[PDB]
Amino acid sequence: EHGHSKMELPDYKQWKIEGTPLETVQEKLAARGLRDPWGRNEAWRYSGGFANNVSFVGALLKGFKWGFAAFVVAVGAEYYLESQ
Amino acid sequence: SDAPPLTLEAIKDRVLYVLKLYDKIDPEKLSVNSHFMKDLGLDSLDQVEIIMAMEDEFGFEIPDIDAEKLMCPQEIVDYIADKKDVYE
Amino acid sequence: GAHLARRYLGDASKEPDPLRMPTFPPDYGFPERKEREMVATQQEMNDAQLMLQQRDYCAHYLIQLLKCKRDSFPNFLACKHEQHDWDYCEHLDYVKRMKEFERERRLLQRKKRREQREAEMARG
Amino acid sequence: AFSAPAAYLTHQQKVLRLYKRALRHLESWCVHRDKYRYFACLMRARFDEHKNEKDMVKATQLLRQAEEEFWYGQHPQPYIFPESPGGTSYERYECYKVPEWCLDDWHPSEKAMYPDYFAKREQWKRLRRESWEREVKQLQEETPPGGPRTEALPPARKEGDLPPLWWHIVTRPRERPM
Amino acid sequence: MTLCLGAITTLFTALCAITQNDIKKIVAFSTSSQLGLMMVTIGINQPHLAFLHICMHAFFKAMLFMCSGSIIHSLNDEQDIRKMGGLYKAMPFTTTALIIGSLALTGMPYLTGFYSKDLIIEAVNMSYTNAWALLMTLIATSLTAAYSTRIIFFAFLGKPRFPPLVLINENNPLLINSIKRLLIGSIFAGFIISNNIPPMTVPNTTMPLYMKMTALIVTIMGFMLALELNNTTYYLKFKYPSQTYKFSNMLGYYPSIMHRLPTYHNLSMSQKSA
Amino acid sequence: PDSWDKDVYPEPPRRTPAPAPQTSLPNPVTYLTKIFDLLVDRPVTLAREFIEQQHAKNRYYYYHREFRRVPDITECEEKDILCMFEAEMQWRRDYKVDQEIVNIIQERLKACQQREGESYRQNCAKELEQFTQVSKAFQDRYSDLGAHYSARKCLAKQKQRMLAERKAAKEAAAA
Amino acid sequence: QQERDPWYDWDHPDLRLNWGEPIHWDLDMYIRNRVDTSPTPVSWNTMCKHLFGFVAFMLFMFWVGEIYPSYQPVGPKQYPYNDLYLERGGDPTKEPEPVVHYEI
Amino acid sequence: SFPKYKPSRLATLPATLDPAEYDISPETRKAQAERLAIRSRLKREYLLQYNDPNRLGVIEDPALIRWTYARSANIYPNFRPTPKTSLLGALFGIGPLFFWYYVFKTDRDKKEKLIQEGKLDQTFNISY
Amino acid sequence: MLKIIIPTTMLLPMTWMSKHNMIWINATVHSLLISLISLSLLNQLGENSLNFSLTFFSDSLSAPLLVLTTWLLPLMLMASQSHLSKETTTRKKLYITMLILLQLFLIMTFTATELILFYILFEATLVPTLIIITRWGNQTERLNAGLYFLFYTLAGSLPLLVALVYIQNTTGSLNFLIIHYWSHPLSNSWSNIFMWLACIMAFMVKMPLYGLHLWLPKAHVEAPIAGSMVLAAVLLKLGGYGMMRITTILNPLTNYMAYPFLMLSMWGMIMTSSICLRQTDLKSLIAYSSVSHMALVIVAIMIQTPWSFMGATALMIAHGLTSSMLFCLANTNYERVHSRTMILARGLQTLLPLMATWWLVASLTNLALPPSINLIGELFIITASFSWSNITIILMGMNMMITALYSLYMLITTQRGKYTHHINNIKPSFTRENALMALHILPLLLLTLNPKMILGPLY
Amino acid sequence: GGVHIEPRYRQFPQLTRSQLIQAEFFSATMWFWILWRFWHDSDAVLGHFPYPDPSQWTDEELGILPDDED
Amino acid sequence: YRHSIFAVTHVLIPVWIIHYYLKYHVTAKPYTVVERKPRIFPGDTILETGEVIPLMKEFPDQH
Ligand SMILES: CCCCCCCCCCCCCCCCCC(=O)OC[C@H](COP(=O)([O-])OCC(O)COP(=O)([O-])OC[C@@H](COC(=O)CCCCCCCCCCCCCCCCC)OC(=O)CCCCCCCCCCCCCCCCC)OC(=O)CCCCCCCCCCCCCCCCC
């Protein structure tokens, strides 16, 4: 029992330079009279769940919202309990 | 590991998929037996870039002496099969 | 740190050498000289066997802190008052050491002013 | 690795090898795919305007200064594939590679298990035994006088023949035996 | 002698870690720098503080290697960070564990690494020691923050850089539970151990506010400078390396010379004369 | 323990504090000792009682050997091999006994250092003094003899030491 | 033996040797397990100069820091009972000279 | 214009930086052909012996035998007493011995003098 | 003591009267029984000795050596069973007779209450081993090895005979008890210096001392496996034993006559350990390692302190066992490869895993890994030398480093790496070889539990 | 021991909700611990006792005399 | 069941053996097991003697 599900290769025409820094590279290359021949070979790195990025500080603050909410609830509960 | 065993059919598909994304080659004309130098009118630098693309696709490195005489997609598929020891 | 910069860039003689403080008698300032008080005796401080570096003028608060930690063991946040008391006593001791350092520096400065004034008077 | 080497490398072989080294070390320098693609296209262009040089002295001074520039800018820690001669798993599985003749020394109780495998092995040994007597004569008749000039072996030219010196090429242990 | 040896060790190993590309090598150089810090702590006559640092470093460095190994296994035995791309969302548990361990390593307040590294820096600042060793300890703290930033940025933040066949898989109870036990450790064990042991040294109760904060400012400066310098790799310009980069990447050239000069001479002399 | 004599290996009275809990919270230590006792100490005690009664069913004794005193090397003729032999064996036995005495004092010192905890530098001065005295005597008696030591070499060393002592005393008295 | 071609099909792949080729006098000194002479990205003399300079500079600076130690502006610690005379060494039959500390 | 690379004994010259491989001569080509011919003859012999199904032993290598024999048994018959041999032998076989003798004799003389003076503090020095 | 001498003598008749196919079994069984009987000699007393009679006496220095000598013979027979398979019955019985005669001489040498009898048997051992080397040796260099081994020994030993007869004519006896009891100091004179040299050279030549060691690689490489085992394990210790006997009459001359030999051994252990790093032969490497260990033993004996003597005894026993095991492993490889070259047969951990772990344990004991008795002897000698002079620690530490280096080099080259492709006759390890390795190694790890048995008479 | 996850070939790999909730939970507890400890023990970071200024101390407090008593 | 039998055969038997060996053999000889004497603070009582350690000196308690 292993991972044998007959995985199929996705369509080859999905990969477009559009909307990716590969356009920036392509425009800068055409400005000097050149083009990249392997641009669409790397487009899959900017298409699916890889399209959205997280900043360094945003990466460090991975669970800050729920932790802050729990801390506020806990401090409120302690404030209510102590004053009795 | 938990890596699926690659098969001859699978290697052929990935080689053709990599070659199709090479915009210098027309995708509707390329075939398994299509020679790079004549049937596609490619250069030597283009062939070596193709070999680089296959190396990055399959995660291993073909030696230069062996790579410089790989001129067909079927040739590359057979070489990869020989290296990974895939009999099916 | 600024004292380091003053000593190593300015006049070394005008600032104390930390290895040999003090260089002036304790009675040089005023004759009262209230003595330092020890609470922990020799015997029970030995029985508590604190440490040789911990047997300073703040030892009694350390004795109470160890006793509190021993009695209220499972709930190890029980006794903060004694820990804070020991910390404050050590803070007072460090402030006293700072006051000793400043007194030595000012005594040296006044002694230098005195000898230069005496030299000027002798020259004049 | 598989193909036999020649007596020397021609000019185009050195050009292609330098191109590969430069591109790989550039990829090692510029890590991101878009930056690498831009600078690889720039390198190809910089590698290309001297393509049509006709006289060989200029094409020899060229690629000799280029080798010096590469050695200056070679990124002393290039990316290496894990199974490559410098990789982190170059010979990782080489201790699991056991020769096939070791099977000959198994106890008969060991060979009692896996009987089909040993029947097939006996068939293979018989095939090798006959093919060897054929291929020795083939090699003796085909080799030039004065001995071989290159490390090249000829294919089998008859119907029932097998390529000379084939046993230790097809009976490799495995890439990852375990 | 111990203090000077520890200072030079931690500085040199942090500097070497600053520019490595193998994740295991970076973590190993981090371990060597932390050992140098432990030796520095020994040099200022603080044995119990060094032992506490040993205890905390156990937890968080073991979990950092755990995460590194998980990354390597999930990426088909790949160890170079140049082919590690966007793993922040592909591997959420490895990402969160590595972030927690890196923040513990750099001395994030009220974590496991706080209760040892913070007090070690405090004790180094308020002791009669070398100025050079103190400066090297501070620079080593900054470089520790810097190479933690390097690992996180180059392994978890960009676009994917690994081969197209994706075999990422974290869903194994063994790996998850083994990581999470050390996660709970690296979060709470420092506090628990610090308030559960008896006092065996005098504290630094009173201190200048700027000197009390020195570790935090140094770590934040390292974070910011490393992040700013790493963000320039996105720029579409290429420049050749300097001499300092070459010195840092080839490990001060110590492994080359010291593994070629003496051994060649020792081996040659043995065969030729003896 | 009646197995060893308390006088050769002295031990302090072992003053221990009484448990004075300040919080109603139940410490796991006391419960852990209770379960440890119930689950370990009782079966071990019963097995020991069985073993001890089996031993008591068959009681027999062994004795410590007594060695007579023999004239030593100082009253031995120059070539009298038999008296020299007996004196040499007596000297070797005395050497072994002296080694064991030094071992006893060293064990005393080690036990003191471990027991006194953080105040060993002050509470182990007596043991250090006894060990210093015993070690000085032992070093004077037996040091520098070599691998081929004998009673004659020890006697010669002692004679040279007392010759130096006599010379020093004569110099001091007539100073 | 480390700088021989790693992709050639040697008869001895680990030693990178061929059957019948001359062995070399110091084969056991170059076996990829011992000293190698592969060219380095930086010249040998440059590496030697940089390493020696770094080590010598660190030694000189550590000596300088020994000359100029760092410390806080405080006096020495005060220990009550005659600088803890009995607890460090003892000798209680000597009556040491009484030293006392100043309260400020 | 980039800084040049200077080779050393333990850091040799790269093949791509050899001026020889850029000075191409027909003599060089024929020499390379001869070297490849010799190597291929040796490879052919080795593989003919190696793939033989009748062989059930070790393929004896005369190169290994020559290496070991030259290393061990061929030294003395080719030795000649020359200024270099005599000087190096005397140095490497006598100088260390006398240096260590001087060092140990000096150390022991100082130790004995201190012991005779009585100022060594051999307290607790029982086992020797 | 005749309860061990007579059965050994008894082995010869049994071997000759034995069936053509039953000599090995009978010899091994009865030699093992004699070895078991020899264990009664280990019950020593802290007083003088076990003086059995006027001729023989046992001590806590002689007892471990006697036990090792009696234990070796079954292992030598087990190792010799293999390569003598195609040998005639008369010649096999002659080989077993040579081994029995050698064991008899070795047994009678260690007891030997009188010095002239000790010398007579101490040189009688020279004949059977010479015959074994020069008759049942494979290479053509066995003749030269035999000549070197004979003549080095005899040149070193004849002045010893002259010195011994002179000493008996001056003192009146050579009995060791009378010599020890009636001992007198040696005056500082030229005649006394030369008497010291004559008494010392015979035993320094067979350790061997550095510079006087050229016979040992020859005699050990070219000898058969049993010859190598008996040469390395027991025949090297004889001189050591002899020194701890004779140095009782060489004081206080030894206080300064030992300087040349102390310097020679201290530098020679380093030199030979470094030689071991560049060696193309396994047996030569093991022989040079033996030279280094015996140089350490020489230093121990010359220091003349109780810790030195304890360390020397422990080191001799441990080195004997370890070197015998190493030679046996090398011979197991040789009987398959027939080359005796270290670099040719590689990657043998893949093919013979149990042989690989035997190699690992033998190397680890060669590294002097605690708490093995090799480490005990090493550490005692090092501590005694440090007491002698603090600067010796540099040389001892360097020797330890190089020892670990070359031992692990020997292990890695032969066991690790990739197997040689063209060697296809690597048969599985026989039960006999595994039993030989186990019977070599288990006594070492059993002796590490009771060190006082092999720490000598000064314990 | 785990679950069945299949390769994707140039797509984002599948993620179980269990691993997401577990990672988010542990990050949340880490940040909550940091905030709670800072709230209840803030002096562990900033300090509890103010730093005295040597200049503020008066001349009499140190017993300093301007060349008057001697 | 597996955990219970494992704890019986891997925890209980070794602890029984070690407790027997330590209680009845190791501690039979002197100084084999040496304990650092427990700390004594003012105000504690001793089980053997029953006396009370006197309190401290009543330092001025403010802040
Ligand atoms: C009391 C006052 C308190 C306030 C204090 C001051 C406050 C802050 C002030 C700021 C001070 C400096 C901060 C910036 C650090 C520099 C970072 C940088 O720009 O590097 C890039 C830059 C060039 O980058 P690149 O070559 O293009 O890299 C290629 C790609 O980027 C390839 O990139 P990559 O992807 O492969 O990897 C990138 C990696 C690779 O980049 C590198 O190559 C790293 C190398 C430089 C980093 C080293 C920084 C500290 C060095 C300490 C050395 C100790 C002495 C050594 C002595 C040497 C002896 C010869 O870089 C990084 O990861 C980040 C760099 C580290 C920065 C973060 C930490 C540093 C901040 C803290 C510094 C001081 C504050 C201490 C805090 C406490 C206050 C006491 O490197 C340099 O130019 C070097 C600058 C400094 C080198 C000093 C050594 C020179 C020695 C020459 C001889 C001198 C005379 C000696 C006499 C001897 C007589 C015998």
Ligand SMILES: CCCCCCCCCCCCCCCCC[C@@H](O)O[C@H](CO[C@H](O)CCCCCCCCCCCCCCC)COP(=O)(O)OCC[N+](C)(C)C
């Ligand atoms: C090659 C590998 C090793 C082989 C064996 C080597 C070991 C043999 C070395 C012999 C040990 C030393 C022999 C003699 C040493 C005597 C002490 C001498 O060295 O010191 C001075 C001796 O003075 C001079 O050395 C005089 C002797 C000079 C001639 C002797 C030759 C020395 C080197 C020979 C080495 C050759 C070795 C091989 C020989 C075959 C002290 O002068 P002094 O205090 O007044 O006289 C003390 C002696 N008295 C009291 C008996 C009178």
Ligand SMILES: CCCCCCCC/C=C\CCCCCCCC(=O)O[C@H](COC(=O)CCCCCCC/C=C/CCCCCCCC)COP(=O)(O)OCCN
């Ligand atoms: C491995 C090869 C080593 C070869 C052995 C070399 C050993 C060298 C030792 C000297 C050999 C003979 C010593 C004599 C035996 C002791 C007897 C004795 O001490 O009596 C002396 C005899 O002393 C001698 O005769 C010694 C003369 C030496 C003759 C042979 C010289 C050999 C070479 C000498 C120089 C080298 C010595 C050391 C070499 C070490 C090995 C390399 C004097 O006795 P009396 O005269 O009766 O009393 C004094 C009042 N009349």
Ligand SMILES: CCCCCCCCCCCC(=O)SCCNC(=O)CCNC(=O)[C@H](O)C(C)(C)COP(=O)(O)O
């Ligand atoms: C980052 C690391 C540093 C990088 C430095 C690298 C810089 C190198 C660039 C320098 C410029 C040169 O290449 S130097 C140029 C050397 N001279 C020539 O190239 C002339 C003729 N070239 C050929 O004939 C080839 O075969 C060719 C036609 C190219 C292909 O042939 P194919 O049709 O069979 O593919």
